[PDB]
Each structure stands twice: as structure tokens, then as C-alpha cells.
Design a protein around this ligand. Structure first.
Ligand SMILES: Nc1nc2c(ncn2[C@H]2C[C@H](O)[C@@H](COP(=O)(O)OP(=O)(O)OP(=O)(O)O)O2)c(=O)[nH]1
Ligand SMILES: Nc1nc2c(ncn2[C@H]2C[C@H](O)[C@@H](COP(=O)(O)OP(=O)(O)OP(=O)(O)O)O2)c(=O)[nH]1
Ligand SMILES: Nc1nc2c(ncn2[C@H]2C[C@H](O)[C@@H](COP(=O)(O)OP(=O)(O)OP(=O)(O)O)O2)c(=O)[nH]1
Ligand SMILES: Nc1nc2c(ncn2[C@H]2C[C@H](O)[C@@H](COP(=O)(O)OP(=O)(O)OP(=O)(O)O)O2)c(=O)[nH]1
Ligand SMILES: [Mg+2]
Ligand SMILES: [Mg+2]
Ligand SMILES: [Mg+2]
Ligand SMILES: [Mg+2]
Ligand SMILES: [Mg+2]
Ligand SMILES: [Mg+2]
Ligand SMILES: [Mg+2]
Ligand SMILES: [Mg+2]
Ligand SMILES: [Mg+2]
Ligand SMILES: [Mg+2]
Ligand SMILES: [Mg+2]
Ligand SMILES: [Mg+2]
Lengths: 237, 237, 237, 237
């Protein structure tokens, strides 16, 4: 050797046994990316589906992933809790998911933005997070979907006031400050004749991914017991 | 909130202060990748330069990277020890580097393999490693370059016995087993008239990357004090 | 400051939320300790009760400890899973438990070994371990009690062959090698007229500690659902 | 097994190679302890020497400790950077030091407080901290000694105003608020005829411990190059 001792400094990063491991990817500086690639506000069917695409690439190229959830510039992958893939080394789980996803992005870019030219190669960030119980995991997801629902309902009526109402951003925010759920939902139905509840289920619920085999996308609620009692092969395994 | 508590389970991963942080990327299952994309043995000018390309993308899109080194299906990025980028969160450092690199790969694929068609989107793995001293860091690099030199000298004469000598792999390995440095180096000069020491400096030394501004590639030795006394802006900062 | 920056190098050690934290203490070089303080084989009522003593000291001086279990030169303390004591910093949990226990040992030494003189100050080691589920925690305990039962049944018949049978250690081990449960249990009943099942419940079951208030010691089985259905205030909290 | 799988949940805690490991002990609730055991303000020769005692116990019973430093209710042990004791497992280093120290405390209590009766068994806390360079380590110590010097100079004149000047605490603090170094140092020399610089070197410099063999206590400055150039066997090893 004479130099291989340096390998000793590599610290362990094993994830806690019998726990759900979760890798959450989120595009870097994507606010600036959507700009330069003219993304549709508040939702851009192309983007969401490209992301859902990459997501599947990942769910197929990697392993033990029993579910994924996407929304905005992000995706979460939930590996089977008894996974033994890579000895549960957190560093592996996050870097493979992250790299795979990022190379799949530029790859399938044309399939979704046939007209639009990818200006530069995009960045993504990762992280691993361990959830000890099905409840905590479930809660994690709900935290995400719910985050989605709170952002879409905000952006939908936020951009309708800028575009279809001709208001500068600084205004639309000043006008929506303090509004409740029914508050915004009304500003839509009555101020733009938009019935939120009719919006695409991929904008107000995000995207789910399950095996059916292959990773079939869905836009159903995952916060309610129903979805889970309907799909028990996912958690009790 | 009502669900945001789940965020609390995200464990710290801060890297030890005043230490060199190092991210080392290495292509996944690349043995099978080089196969399907017909890579040249023992070296493939295209591959090495694409890698060196991505590497620069990374050194520009990210920050505080004072040096990089590449070889085979890998690259190491050494961030400035007093870096404060991302509060030294190991998870960030590795996933950005990994994702960026992977998206840049498919992006600039044509520029290097204009003829060859990228068959699928490639995978990369990451990791962070902290080195407490300039000596240990330097040793790390030497470990890499030296690893490079030991593999190239082995593969060069390993493939010359299979290709230009018509030997099955199982043979060439049985014939090289136990050979010393001068042993292989001779099997070349006298059995194929190949003077190893004349081989491309990018095959037997790998690739280095420094600022000159922009990331200029080099193929000089980094194991010898010379290189460092010649470039002190890199370590003593 | 001018020197306080060094405080920054103190790494986080927070234990995973909603998880059972467990500190397990085990006397250092106690084999040599029991020797010099003439401990009774295979059990020494003094030792076990001193340990159970210290254990209570700990359960009172520290907090959120919902249960403890002792045996041989060790004790395990199980903190309430939603504990927030010390922000769940693993380093605190283990060092307080360890120090407290060690000072209580020398303190109450006379109360248990009134005749015997403590020769030197004894050492103890600690560690923290996180268990994600009640099942895993329960399993942990069973692992301990069961370890206890497997050692006591071995030592009881191991020392009866050395003392009451006049056999050198090397022999008694050669004679017990390969024996089953009923094998040793018989070597007792028929070779020394000792009915194992009649042995003190503190030798073959160890010691448990629960609040009743104060930490009341017990010597009942904790591997069987009974104990738990009998004491639900412990886990479901 | 059938239960031993639970052992798998024990996470690694290895300290970074080629780095100074440091265990810092600090008495728990000692403010209340000194009270009940009538400690002398601002310094109590008994306490400081008992602590320095325990400290030596530790430096002898454990290993690779190349130096220690004490002051107030605390002590720091600095293990030799290339130590391999316990595979550098942080959990071991801190719990042994902590337990050993705590049992030695109650043990040698009489030798220092022959008159005073130890009321209850005392608590201590631990932690491990890794320093990458001799400079950072040195700085750590200076941080401690300097902390000592800043507290002793504050307490000395803080208690002289309460005792020898008959002022309630709330006052003495209101009077010392905003004073500089020369400010307090003068309030002494001129208001109580006390020349600080003449105070015991164990009160304004703390305590150091080196091998000479055995752990010989000292009260010299360790912040100045002198001490180190005078003792090079400690760091360059
Ligand atoms: N117009 C448009 N922009 C979108 C859409 N989905 C995501 N984005 C963009 C704008 C959002 O600021 C961004 C996602 O939020 P982030 O918090 O990740 O912001 P950003 O990516 O700048 O931050 P980060 O990369 O995490 O540092 O992606 C979409 O459907 N349409
Ligand atoms: N023909 C050819 N293959 C190359 C060249 N550079 C790298 N490779 C391939 C073959 C090597 O097995 C591989 C790099 O070694 P690795 O140990 O990373 O193997 P592999 O990527 O299969 O493992 P891993 O992905 O780490 O699990 O990349 C090249 O210039 N020419
Ligand atoms: N005679 C006697 N010895 C006992 C009794 N309880 C414990 N011991 C002693 C002998 C055992 O070897 C030791 C506990 O087992 P350990 O595996 O902890 O051994 P030891 O303490 O030497 O190792 P360690 O300190 O963990 O490095 O304590 C007892 O009741 N009677
Ligand atoms: N009278 C007196 N008290 C002392 C002496 N040395 C230490 N102490 C006591 C009073 C100080 O508040 C205490 C050491 O400071 P700490 O910050 O450790 O306070 P305390 O032990 O309450 O906090 P902790 O246990 O860390 O939670 O020990 C001494 O020589 N004389
Ligand atoms: Mg983010
Ligand atoms: Mg983002
Ligand atoms: Mg986002
Ligand atoms: Mg590898
Ligand atoms: Mg590879
Ligand atoms: Mg490789
Ligand atoms: Mg042990
Ligand atoms: Mg032991
Ligand atoms: Mg034991
Ligand atoms: Mg403290
Ligand atoms: Mg204290
Ligand atoms: Mg203190």
C-alpha cells in the first residue's frame, strides 16, 4: 500500500435498522431554471411529467423502492424498511438516486420539452431521512402532499391575479395575505370563475408511484387511510 | 403544521471544521457501460475527456473547490478546508456534485462521442471524506494517482497480450501474476515494442484540474513535492 | 473570544426522535474485580443487589427512565421514547448514567460488602442504542434476560463441577461442551441433587426495576407477554 | 440467537483518524454540590486537589492520555492522536473516563475532605471532541485555561465584595459590570489590598498533568509557546 491508509478516514453512515429510509430530491436553483425554460405557472404539465419520468427511471434502476411521491421541483423515494441494499449506507442511497435522476433528466428532456431547448445541465440535491414507524413515514408523505396542496392553492390564485387580473406580484401577495382556505378558493370561483376542485389532480395532489410490473403514476390522496387500506402491500411487508 | 414535526428526524451531517472535505465520484456499473458504448482499452480518449469535462462543469457550478483529480470512472473534488458552503453539510456536498456531474455527462455526451449513441442514462455514486492535514490530503491524492499508475501499467500490458498477442484473458492474468514493475514494463518494450514511459500522460498520470479564470486540465505528477511547491495557492490559503 | 471557536468542533449526537433510547452499562474488567473482592460463584447476592442499588440511584437522579434491567456486571436503562431530556444528546445520556452509577457504587459499597474492603475504584463503560419499535425494545430486553438465563444455567452447573465435584475448569468445560438445556439441567438434578428451577429468581431471571413512588426490584420474566399486559403504563405512554 | 439481531442497531462512533481526541468532564449540578459540602469561595484547595486526584486515577487506569487540564468542576483529557485504544470508539473514551473519575471521587473523598461528610453520590457528564491540528488542540486548552483566568479574576473580586466588603450578590455584580482586566485587578489591590498576581497559581492558571513514571501536577501557563517548547514529547509523538 503505502498510501491506502487514507481509506481509513471514511466514516460510517449506516441507517438505523428496521426503519424506513427516505431519499428526497429537490432541484437546485430551479426557480431560475423554470424561468429560462419558460415553465407554465402555476403548473407545467411537461415539467411534472419529466420529473415523474426520471422518478421511474430511478425506481427501476435502483432497488427496494416501495413508493415515490413528487411535486414541484422534488421527489421522495421510500425504500423498504428491511432493505439491505448497500448495507443501508446513507451515502450510497442518496448519491445514486441523485445522479441517476439528474442524468435521466437531460436524457428524456426532449420527450417532454420537444420544442424547448435545454439551456444548461441542471442541479439536484439529496438527503436521506430515517422514519421509525409507518405512522411517521405516512406523516412524512402527508407533510409533502399537504405542502403541495398549500402551494398549488396559493400559486393558482396568485398567478390568476397577476396574469388574468393584471396585478403586479407585490400586490397579489398583499391581497392574499391572511386569506384562509375558503378565502382563496372563493377569490377563484368568484373572481376568475375558476373552480379549484376541478383543477388537474396532478396539480393539487401531486404524483404518486407504485408497482403494478411497472411504476404506475397516480394523483390520488395519500393522506387518507383509504389509499393505504387500498394498498397494503406497500407498508406491511 | 400538523405534519411538519417529521422534519425533526433529519440528522446532522456537518463535516469537521478546519478540515479538507473531499467528494469522490465513481461511475456505477461502468464496466458494463464502457462495454455497451465500445470504450477503447486500456484508455479511451473520449471517456477520460468527457469525465474531465463534467468535472469542470462541477468545479464551476459549485464552489470552494480548490482542486480535482480524475482517472478511470472517477473524480475527486477537494473543497477549500475553511469552506462554509452549505454549513459543511456532507449530504449537500455529495449530492450536488453527484447530480451535477451526472446531468453534465448526458448533456455533453455528443461533444465527445459524436458517433456513438448513448444507450441509457448512466449512474454515479458519491461520498464525502474529511482529511485533517495537508499531508493526509496529499496522501489521498497520491493514493489515487498511484492507483491510476498501477492500473494503467497493468491494463496496458494486459490488453496487449489479449489483442496484439492473441491471448484469452484467463491467460494474460496467469502470465502477469507475480510480475514486478520492471517485469511488466519489459513485457511491453520487448514483447510489443511499446515504451510505456511514452504513453499519453493522461493514461499513466490521470488528470488534474486547477484554476488559471478557468479549470485547466493537466497530466503532471502530484505525488512529488515539485507540483505543490510549484502551486502553493492551492493548499496554503 | 479569540479561542472559543474551538467549541465549534463539537459534533451533534442527537438520538432519533420517537425512538426508545437505551443506555447499557457494563463493569470494566469486572472478572478481575470479582476475583479481588471474593465474589460468590455463580451468583453473589451482595454484588447483584449493589448493582440493583446503583441502578435505582440512577433511575432517581436522572429522568424519563421508564425501566431498567440488570444481570451480571451490567444494567440497561430505557428512557421514555418521547423523552426530551438533554435534547436527546446521546453523549449526555450515557455519561451521566455511567458516572452516577460509578460514584454510587463506591458510595453504597459498605451497605452490601460490610466485611469486604473495596480494594480500588471500579470502572464502567456505557453506550446508547436506539430502538424504533416496542417490539425491538422488548426483543432487546429478552435478549438480555435470555442472555442471563443462558449464562446462569451454564455457570451454575459449571461451578458445581469444579467445587462440589472437584474438577479443574478445563474439564468442566470439556464435559459441558455440546450439552442441551435438559442436558445441563439434568447434570444438576442427578449429579448434585440441585433443582435448577428452584434457584433464586434473581439468578435465573436477573432483575427488573419499575415505579410503584419508587423503583421496586423484581425477578419475574419480561420475555412473556404477561409481564407487559400486566404493566402497560411502561410502553404505551 | 433468536434475539441477538437487536445488537445490529448499535451505531458506529469512531473518531476521525490522526486527530486529537479529547474527553471533557464537568460535574453535574456542582453549584449545588459545593453548597452542601461548604466549598471555599472563590477557590477550595480540597476540591481542586480531589479533582486533580481523580484526574490522575483516570490517566493511570485508562491509556494513551498524553495530558490533562483541570479547573472548576471540570477536567479535560487529551488522548494521543494516533491512539488506537478501543478502535477510537467515542462512546468508550467518554464513558470510561466519566465512570472511573466518578468512582474515584467518592473513593478518595476522605483524603481531601477528612472533616466534611460526603452527603450523596455526585454526578459527572462527558463528551468527546476531535481536534484536527496541534494548533486547534492547543487553542482548545488555551480556551480552557483562559476561561479559568477570566472566572477566577471575576470570582476573587466578586466574593471579596460580598464577604470582606459586606455587599449582597446583586450589588457586587452591578458594581463589576463593565469592568476591564485592570478594572477588577485594581478593585482588589486598592479596595482589599489583594495583589491578584500573588494568588495561588492553582487558582489563576488551573492545573496541568504530565508524565515524569507518574502524572505530576503543575500550575504553569500552557497558552504560551514556552510551555510547549519546554515539553515537546507531548505533541510531536
Ligand atoms: N413556472 C414554474 N416554476 C416551477 C414549477 N415547478 C417548480 N417550479 C420552480 C419555481 C420554484 O421556486 C422552484 C421549486 O422551489 P424551491 O424551493 O426548490 O426553489 P429553488 O429550486 O430555487 O431552491 P433550491 O434549488 O432548493 O435552492 O421550482 C412549475 O410547474 N412552474
Ligand atoms: N474499456 C474501458 N473501460 C473503462 C475505461 N475507464 C473505465 N472503464 C470501465 C471498466 C472498469 O471496470 C470501470 C471502472 O472501475 P470500477 O471499479 O468503478 O467498476 P464498476 O464501475 O463496474 O464498479 P462500480 O460501478 O463501482 O460498482 O469502468 C476506459 O478507458 N476503457
Ligand atoms: N464470581 C462472580 N463473578 C461475577 C459475578 N457477576 C459478574 N461477575 C464477573 C465475572 C464476569 O467475567 C464479569 C462480567 O462479564 P464481562 O463480560 O463484563 O467481563 P469483564 O467485566 O471482564 O469484561 P469487560 O469489563 O466488559 O471488558 O463479572 C458474580 O455474581 N460472581
Ligand atoms: N464554592 C466553590 N464552588 C465551586 C468551586 N469550584 C466549582 N464550584 C461550583 C460552583 C460552580 O457553579 C460549579 C461549576 O460550574 P458549572 O457551570 O459546572 O455549574 P453546574 O455544575 O451547576 O452546572 P452543570 O452541572 O454543568 O449543569 O461548581 C470552588 O472552588 N468553590
Ligand atoms: Mg432545499
Ligand atoms: Mg429547489
Ligand atoms: Mg421545491
Ligand atoms: Mg465503488
Ligand atoms: Mg464504478
Ligand atoms: Mg473505478
Ligand atoms: Mg463489553
Ligand atoms: Mg465487563
Ligand atoms: Mg458482562
Ligand atoms: Mg455543562
Ligand atoms: Mg457543572
Ligand atoms: Mg463548570
Amino acid at each position: 500500500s503505502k498510501f491506502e491508509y487514507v481509506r481509513d478516514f471514511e466514516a460510517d453512515d449506516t441507517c438505523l435498522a428496521h426503519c424506513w429510509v427516505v431519499v428526497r430530491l429537490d432541484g437546485r436553483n430551479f426557480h431560475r431554471f423554470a424561468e429560462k425554460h419558460n415553465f407554465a405557472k402555476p403548473n407545467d404539465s411537461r415539467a411534472l411529467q419529466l420529473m415523474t419520468k426520471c422518478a421511474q427511471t430511478v425506481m427501476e434502476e435502483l432497488e427496494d423502492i416501495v413508493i415515490a411521491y413528487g411535486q414541484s421541483d422534488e421527489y421522495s423515494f421510500v425504500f423498504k424498511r428491511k432493505t439491505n441494499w448497500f448495507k443501508r449506507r446513507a451515502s450510497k442511497f442518496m448519491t445514486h438516486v441523485a445522479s441517476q435522476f439528474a442524468s435521466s433528466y437531460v436524457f428524456y428532456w426532449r420527450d417532454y420539452f420537444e420544442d424547448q431547448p435545454l439551456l444548461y445541465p441542471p442541479g439536484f440535491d439529496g438527503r436521506v431521512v430515517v422514519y421509525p414507524s409507518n405512522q411517521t413515514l405516512k406523516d412524512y408523505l402527508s407533510w409533502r402532499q399537504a405542502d403541495c396542496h398549500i402551494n398549488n392553492l396559493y400559486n393558482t390564485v396568485f398567478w390568476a391575479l397577476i396574469q388574468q387580473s393584471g396585478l403586479t406580484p407585490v400586490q397579489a401577495q398583499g391581497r392574499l395575505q391572511g386569506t384562509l382556505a375558503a378565502d382563496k378558493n372563493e377569490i377563484l370561483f368568484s373572481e376568475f370563475n375558476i373552480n379549484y376542485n376541478n383543477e388537474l389532480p396532478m396539480y393539487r395532489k401531486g404524483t404518486v408511484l407504485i408497482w403494478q410490473t411497472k411504476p404506475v403514476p397516480l394523483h390520488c390522496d395519500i393522506i387518507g387511510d383509504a389509499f393505504w387500506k387500498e394498498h397494503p402491500e406497500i407498508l406491511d411487508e
